[PDB]
Amino acid sequence: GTGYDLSASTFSPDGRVFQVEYAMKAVENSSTAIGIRCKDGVVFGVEKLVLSKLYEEGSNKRLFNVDRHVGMAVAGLLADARSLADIAREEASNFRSNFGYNIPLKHLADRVAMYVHAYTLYSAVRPFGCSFMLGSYSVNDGAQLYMIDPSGVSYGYWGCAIGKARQAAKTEIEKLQMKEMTCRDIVKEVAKIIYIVHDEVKDKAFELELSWVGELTNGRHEIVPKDIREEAEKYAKESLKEEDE
Amino acid sequence: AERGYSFSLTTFSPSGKLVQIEYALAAVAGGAPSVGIKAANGVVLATEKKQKSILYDERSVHKVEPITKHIGLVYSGMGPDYRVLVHRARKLAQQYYLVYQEPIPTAQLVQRVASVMQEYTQSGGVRPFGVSLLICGWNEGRPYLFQSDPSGAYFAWKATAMGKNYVNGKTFLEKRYNEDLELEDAIHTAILTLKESFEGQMTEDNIEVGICNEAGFRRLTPTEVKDYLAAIA
Amino acid sequence: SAGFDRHITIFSPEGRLYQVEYAFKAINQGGLTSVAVRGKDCAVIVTQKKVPDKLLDSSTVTHLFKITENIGCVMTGMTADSRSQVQRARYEAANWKYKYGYEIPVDMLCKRIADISQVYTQNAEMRPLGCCMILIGIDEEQGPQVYKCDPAGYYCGFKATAAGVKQTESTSFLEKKVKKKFDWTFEQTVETAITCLSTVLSIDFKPSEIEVGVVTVENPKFRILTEAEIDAHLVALAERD
Amino acid sequence: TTIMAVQFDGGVVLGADSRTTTGSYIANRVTDKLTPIHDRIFCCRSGSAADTQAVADAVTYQLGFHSIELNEPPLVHTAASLFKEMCYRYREDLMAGIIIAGWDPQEGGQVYSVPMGGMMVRQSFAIGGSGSSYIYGYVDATYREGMTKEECLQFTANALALAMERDGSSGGVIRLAAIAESGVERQVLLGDQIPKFA
Amino acid sequence: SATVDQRLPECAKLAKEGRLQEVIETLLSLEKQTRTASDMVSTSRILVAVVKMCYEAKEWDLLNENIMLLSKRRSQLKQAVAKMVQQCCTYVEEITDLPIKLRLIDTLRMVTEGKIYVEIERARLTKTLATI
Amino acid sequence: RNQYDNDVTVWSPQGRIHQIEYAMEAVKQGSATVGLKSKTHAVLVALKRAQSELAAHQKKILHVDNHIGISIAGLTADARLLCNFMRQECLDSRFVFDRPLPVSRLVSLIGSKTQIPTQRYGRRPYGVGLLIAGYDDMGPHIFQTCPSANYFDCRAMSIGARSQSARTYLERHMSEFMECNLNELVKHGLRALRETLPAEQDLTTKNVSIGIVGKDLEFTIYDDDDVSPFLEGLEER
């Protein structure tokens, strides 16, 4: 082996810590989670993989509610993802307890990024093996969407995609006028993009998990209703047939 | 050699060496030249402040620093470790002052700084201080010049040089140093010893010198260093 | 000598810290470059700004941070480490203002950060986070000040510096430009910094692919120049050069 | 002591007497009760000077760090919340009652009153201090919604003048501070600029 | 474009009627727009045309200034600058009053103080200067 | 490998973490257990092993607070530790809030607790897989937790050595579930264990444990002669 890739506290003779890169490799092996920031909201879509017909519907949710007004879409080791969701929930709770108002998403992203960097600093713990996205909307700050990765970088975004099909998802997102779309249509676009990037002969089973947080929810993140998800799924299948034609 | 017994600081090699502290002393010897001469009525410390470029503002980070109104300190080795050690020396001097309403003797300050270095050279998760300190004080009615090593050993010196060319510096000091030397002559001797191991033109603002007489330790201003260089040349 | 390489606390037989050197290599890993120059009464930091995607929010992408009301920094290296060290610098400045009742001097904040880094270089608890911080501020008695806080505890003060991939080229260019009338004005300093970056990178800058922060004696508050100001500087100075 | 705050559309005016007694002797007669928390948020302090000053300094530190980290101006609610956390936590050790008044872009012109204990109540006009009661009843009648900056300044001046007149522990000069978009304008009414009988 | 090169003739007529800098500034704004659009052909025609207008005029202390300007403006397009300098050289060879043409030669040389894409042109200018 | 699977703290150079996979293998050294649920019941059924014909059969169903039971497959030390933790959490919830702890929250607590070891070098991942059967006011629940700290809400699942036979049976017959009497539900579980059993072997009252929870039925474990009404009714192959 390299000899410098054990422990996240060792710099290779290039300035590279390889444990963080291996964590990034681990996240770049999972299902695809995308998120698009429309003008009046943010929509997360995830192509959850039903790994067995035994699991009930809604098992292994990769869309968490990290505080009432903020949604989280994870991609990678789901155990680490749940732990990070708990960490972010605790950070938002502490913010609301101390300062007395809903945590700004920029600040929440920075806090969780600092936590992930804490775990990538040391040799007694391994870097978090998952990426995730934090989305929210409020009247006084506007729709926001951030992405955090195992190395702990918290760049903002207009459209993001993490997982196996990230490059294809970004390519299919660039061809969208997100800055002037509304939630009711960006949800359908999210479903279409997820269906296009999904691989049927490799991943077999599939379930689309959608959520939005936007003006039409009063800044309250929630799972997209049943009828809306059904209509978006129907539109995505029709669009798949159209693209095939 | 004893290759296995050179990565740890808590194991004796079969011959008894503590190889890692000797490696720290090698890091010391691979540092900027510094010279210390104990004159008859004072002490003088010098060290090259040659910068790697014209951009380095050579007035912000000093290498000859005071620790009390009557003690000062220069180093040869790594600058960060030097900063740590000078802060600790100042703290120790202040603790001694608070306990005993009296400025800390130079010998005592050297003992305590050497104890700090010993504390840092007695575990596996800590790196020994890669510097050698030259402490110069005016305790009592006579001058003191001491050296402190990463190993925690401290010496009393008449005159010495440390850094890249310490061998040449010590030979030069053997030739030139005489015990009954006034501080004014010791300053010239210090600057000449530096010149003998100083590449490039020894301009007044790339050399740092500090004196320690009965008036207390004081870092000479660049104007004064320029005057001394002009008089020497 | 490769055995003395996997631990930050092990001295090489010749007395070298290979893990610290590797932290510097890590500095030279973000691809970006940064330059800083101080005139008579101003200091300027300019950083290459890469936004290699239409979906990435350029407003959030940045390497210029406001450590306090009157101190700014440009960070180069790993982004997570950069932001961690920026938070540490802000916390230290706040503590200084709380304890001592006056704003932290730039040199003092640099010494604090350098000491924090030296601690990690000495003990074996963390890796030395691989980022380089260039700080600029206005000191009431000294004037404009530019400093570096490399990840080994070294923090010399600078008339003009650079960090990142092309630090050597930028250093040579600034040495040449400072041997001749180091006395620069605000516009001349911005010219020198932007020209240094452009020449070392072998490219002419769009108003967006560059980020400039400035402090001046008249207005000693770290200001990040807007796109209009950057474009004005580029066009006017290229025209009148 | 006596401290007061009045809210007007787009801003808020704080006012405070300048007496600091240590019994029946004025240790300081030009004390500056008003304290600038961040830039626009101000706190008027009452109770034990040591506790109030320590709390104000700690809150200034916390709010400055918070605002720098957020890259946004702080909220008057956030400042009053920090005060509330500290005061409530150390109820038994802090003999301090505070009035946090200021302006922020989102909810400009805010006045919260954290009295002894840990309460947290927004008010159109807030009053505190030993001499509060008298002017408290007086403002209950005098206050009218829709005042402008000048009317609020005169209102605060008259109120604090009444409190100083009728309270032994309050007296000296009257310090006013009007906060709004433009910034903070502080003034003092020394001996004659302050009403004589009202 | 063709619209550019038909609105340029009216500028030529105005300059012939007498325009010290008004038409110059109009053409500079037009060239600014074209360059920002990154239209190499438009830039080339505008540059060659403005130098042509100057030369047709008296242009003394004006043609050299305009050449210095258009060379020292923002990142002019390579072909645009090459065409401008080539045109100005073809119009330099057909000049007299050497004590004055020397100034234009020097101006062109310092505009071409060295660039891989104007090497030959600078060489010919240097040869003409040496002969002079 | 050979330097990337010594501890849980090192990522292999493939985005893969090896000691967690080794714990997930340890889960297969246990014994077969099948959990499943109707619309008003939840049933765990476990094949108890035997260390000798004299020694009794190791218990595999443990009793968490009245509305929750657990079936274990893997290290018995970790089984004991996790059972104690679950019992303590249920007791704490019933002490603070005068109501039973929701199963979906108990499993979240278990997930966090079991994930903590999978990231810090102070311990090994809990080498025990769990089938948690419970009945909260929402409805009967069957959960699976694996040493990776991942939990799945299963309508019917199986774990342990020789598990895929039972899992295939459950996939084939799960359409029948929900609208089943308790007896039919237990019979389906016993059929799943029969499928995982080697052909020559068969389900006997000695080696079968049957835990049942559901509406108006606090978690009850049937062992030894208690399973007679189930095995006796069960049809033969």
Swiss-Prot record, chain A:
Q: Does the keyword Acetylation apply?
A: yes
Q: Which family does it belong to?
A: Belongs to the peptidase T1A family.
Q: Does the keyword Transcription regulation apply?
A: no
Output the Pfam families linked to this UniProt entry. Answer: Proteasome (PF00227), Proteasome_A_N (PF10584)
Question: Where is it predominantly found?
Answer: cytoplasm
Example GO CC term: the record gives: cytosol
Swiss-Prot/TrEMBL GO biological process terms: proteasome-mediated ubiquitin-dependent protein catabolic process
Q: What's in the keyword line of the UniProt record? A: Acetylation, Cytoplasm, Host-virus interaction, Nucleus, Phosphoprotein, Proteasome
For this entry, the protein name equals Proteasome subunit alpha type-3
Organism in which the protein naturally occurs: Homo sapiens (Human)
Swiss-Prot record, chain B:
In-chain residues carrying the UniProt-annotated modification N-acetylalanine: A1
PTM per Swiss-Prot/TrEMBL? Phosphorylated on tyrosine residues; which may be important for nuclear import.
What NCBIfam families has UniProt attached to this entry? Answer: PRK03996.1
Known function: Component of the 20S core proteasome complex involved in the proteolytic degradation of most intracellular proteins. This complex plays numerous essential roles within the cell by associating with different regulatory particles. Associated with two 19S regulatory particles, forms the 26S proteasome and thus participates in the ATP-dependent degradation of ubiquitinated proteins.
Which gene name belongs to this protein?
PSMA2
Q: What's the name of the protein? A: Proteasome subunit alpha type-2
To which species is this protein native?
Homo sapiens
The record's subcellular locations are: Cytoplasm; Nucleus
UniProt keyword Nucleus, yes or no: yes
Give the principal location in a single coarse category: cytoplasm
From Swiss-Prot, chain D:
Which keywords fit this entry according to its UniProt record?
Acetylation, Cytoplasm, Host-virus interaction, Hydrolase, Nucleus, Phosphoprotein, Protease, Proteasome, Threonine protease, Zymogen
Q: Decide whether keyword GTP-binding is in the record.
A: no
- Quaternary structure, from the entry: The 26S proteasome consists of a 20S proteasome core and two 19S regulatory subunits. The 20S proteasome core is a barrel-shaped complex made of 28 subunits that are arranged in four stacked rings. The two outer rings are each formed by seven alpha subunits, and the two inner rings are formed by seven beta subunits. The proteolytic activity is exerted by three beta-subunits PSMB5, PSMB6 and PSMB7. (Microbial infection) Interacts with HIV-1 protein Tat.
Task: Pull one GO CC term from this UniProt entry.
Answer: mitochondrion
State the disulfide connectivity.
Answer: none
Q: What is its EC number?
A: 3.4.25.1
Domain of life of the organism in this record?
A: Eukaryota
Q: What class of enzyme is it?
A: hydrolase
- List residues, modification Phosphothreonine: T35
Where in or outside the cell?
Cytoplasm; Nucleus
Which function does this protein serve?
A: Component of the 20S core proteasome complex involved in the proteolytic degradation of most intracellular proteins. This complex plays numerous essential roles within the cell by associating with different regulatory particles. Associated with two 19S regulatory particles, forms the 26S proteasome and thus participates in the ATP-dependent degradation of ubiquitinated proteins.
Indicate what this protein is called per its UniProt record.
Proteasome subunit beta type-6
Q: List GO BP terms, alphabetically.
A: proteasome-mediated ubiquitin-dependent protein catabolic process
Q: What induces it?
A: Down-regulated by IFNG/IFN-gamma (at protein level). Up-regulated in anaplastic thyroid cancer cell lines.
Mainly localized where?
Answer: cytoplasm
From Swiss-Prot, chain E:
Q: What is this protein called?
A: 26S proteasome non-ATPase regulatory subunit 12
Q: What does this protein do?
A: Component of the 26S proteasome, a multiprotein complex involved in the ATP-dependent degradation of ubiquitinated proteins. This complex plays a key role in the maintenance of protein homeostasis by removing misfolded or damaged proteins, which could impair cellular functions, and by removing proteins whose functions are no longer required. Therefore, the proteasome participates in numerous cellular processes, including cell cycle progression, apoptosis, or DNA damage repair.
Q: What family does this chain come from, according to its entry?
A: Belongs to the proteasome subunit p55 family.
> What disorder does this protein's entry note?
Stankiewicz-Isidor syndrome: A neurodevelopmental disorder characterized by delayed psychomotor development, intellectual disability, behavioral disorders, mild dysmorphism, ophthalmologic anomalies, feeding difficulties, deafness, and variable congenital malformations of the cardiac and/or urogenital systems.
Subunit comment: Component of the 19S proteasome regulatory particle complex. The 26S proteasome consists of a 20S core particle (CP) and two 19S regulatory subunits (RP). The regulatory particle is made of a lid composed of 9 subunits including PSMD12, a base containing 6 ATPases and few additional components. Interacts with ERCC6.
Q: Which gene encodes it?
A: PSMD12
Species of provenance: Homo sapiens (Human)
Give the position(s) of the covalent cross-link described as Glycyl lysine isopeptide (Lys-Gly) (interchain with G-Cter in SUMO1): K72
Fragment boundaries within the full protein? Answer: 21 to 152 of 456
